[model samples]
Target: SPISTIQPKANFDAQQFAGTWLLVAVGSAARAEATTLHVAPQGTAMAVSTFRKLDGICWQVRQLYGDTGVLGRFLLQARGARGAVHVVVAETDYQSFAVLYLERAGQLSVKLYARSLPVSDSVLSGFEQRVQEAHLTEDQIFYFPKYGFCEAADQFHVLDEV
Candidate 1:
């Protein structure tokens, strides 16, 4: 199916997408874990950089977002060492989880994130179903690892390790 199959929510508002979200699962063949190291240096630079950017973005959420009075479907394209990133706030409720679908080049990853660890089943189910609808494939529906070095090192300034 073409990417056009996935339509944006008519009222794609960020009223809920913006905020703290801890990664729990990833819809990938390998079921790439979101919490731990999953990539080999050169083998998966995009994944490495994506999570790094996720960390950076989450860390500076306040700096990255604000009451811009923006509304409607949100679309952002970020080009980096990897490639151009196509991102969208697939769904959210400002209180529970938010589904973020990302695509760069021919690669895609559907991420289920919650405001905290141990996400609510309702939100998780919704995320799973949504990605499944997106045709994210079997391997795509996978679990993420626990809090790993990247996050910790970044927080404690343990730069060399990450």
Candidate 2:
């Protein structure tokens, strides 16, 4: 039996981890979507913008992640919703891949992100370990396509740019 709880990396530096990352795969209890996100440090908070295909057009979803006083942890308050999401950077190499844990409405998800497409087996194996740690199954894994990424989001395509 695997027993694991959510935990963030120690001494996590937001500046070092700030950059663009491609969501390669996600092991989640709930079926969802993958995205290409850019994270920028804004004082203690982070400004995150995610690009994805929607309605046959590229849309940019913007959200603010507030620092929770814990290293590598952030809280996102969704618009028109009282519930918020807790984000944790579980592990990362800063150059290759990163594993993040997100919890919202009592649901947990393990997300894997890479700097490039088609990561090596070693990275996949590491992600597998994290999935197991989260008590998730391989069947829950979903891969994101490598194409159709928007270079930029137009003003009309921006959402919640706060």
Candidate 3:
């Protein structure tokens, strides 16, 4: 579906965005750049660290800080990359969630999960809009399967109060 017609859900509350989220799944591009970073929540601000890749490689990526409430709308400017990638989350249930990596170019990379399985649909239409905004080419988008659901060893923790 064209993202121009998809409206964002009104129930999104940035305040409720506090907490550590594990990378249970990711798109092909994301997976390639995936890190074992720990996202710490600091009330409105969040931080990330300890990023690694599949080959046990490591990077000195800068720590991330931003409003937790609007994190979904946060524009990410990765090194060596132009434009931005926005990470948006949608909750379908207590444990079921959908995370979208929307590029400004209108290409989409989605990760759907139900605490056990993966799902998809129009709910991710916002991703389409984000892709267009990023100006990504159609061939640039790539989807992949979720890594095995390992124990919640790595996560984005809320450190605002502590």
Candidate 4:
């Protein structure tokens, strides 16, 4: 499915992006692990924590940028691992874009989200392709409510990482 044609209301700002975010809603299959997920960005690294069935695990990533905020990618390295894993392939200028690693049921799930309504069929299809390319068995699903909307105020937050 393509991303929704509706443009995002806000532009991306590196300053505004320098905080922690919570996952408020997610697709049916993702709902199980989406409710309380948190992402915190500090300097060039991001910390992610989420519940895996009954356990919660955290991971960190080192983000690299081409320009201040024009194009960027994130690499996640396990605490004791010798190598880093490509987490987010890339992100664009719109606050509507983001890529990250989603952990569920003790497995790493590649999840992507855009800040637009009525997510386009093409974007959804592309996400499906990436999921398959990543060798994940999950089906294509959209988080109902898409998040970031006014109604999600109580469930989501952009907090100071400190």
How well is each residue in 1-162 modelled by candidate 4, as lDDT tens digits?
Answer: 111121222343445454333332222233324333334455655454432221222222223322323223444433343333444333333354444443333444555555545445766666566566545545434443343222122122332222
Write candidate 3's Cα lDDT for 4-118 as tens digits.
3333334654444434333434333332533333455555555544333434333334345454344344445444455545555544333434454444555555443333333
Candidate 2: pairs in clash: none
Model number with the top TM-score: 2
Candidate 2 matches the true fold with a TM-score of 0.90
For each candidate in turn, the TM-score is 0.57, 0.90, 0.45, 0.41
lDDT of 3 at 136: 51
What C-alpha lDDT values do all the predictions have? Answer: 0.49, 0.82, 0.42, 0.39
Q: Judged by lDDT, which candidate is best? A: 2
Cα lDDT of candidate 3 equals 0.42
lDDT tens digits, residues 1-162, model 1? 123345554564443344345677877542223542221122111112223334443211101111212232222333245344455556666466667666656566677766666788888788888777776766568777645313333444323212
lDDT value, candidate 2, whole model:
0.82
Model 3, clash count? 25
Q: After superposition, how far is residue 117 of candidate 2 from its true place, in Å?
A: 2.0
lDDT of 2 by residue, 1-162 (tens): 011266678888888888899888888887534478898999999999988876667888888999988888888976575577889998888888889888888888888888887777898899988887788898988877766566368989988747
What's the best-to-worst order under lDDT? 2, 1, 3, 4
Residue-pair clashes per prediction, in order, are 7, 0, 25, 17
Worst 10 residues of 1 by lDDT: 59-68
Shift of residue 147 alpha carbon in model 2, Å: 2.0
- In model 2, how large is the Cα lDDT of residue 124? 85
Who is ahead in lDDT, 2 or 3? 2
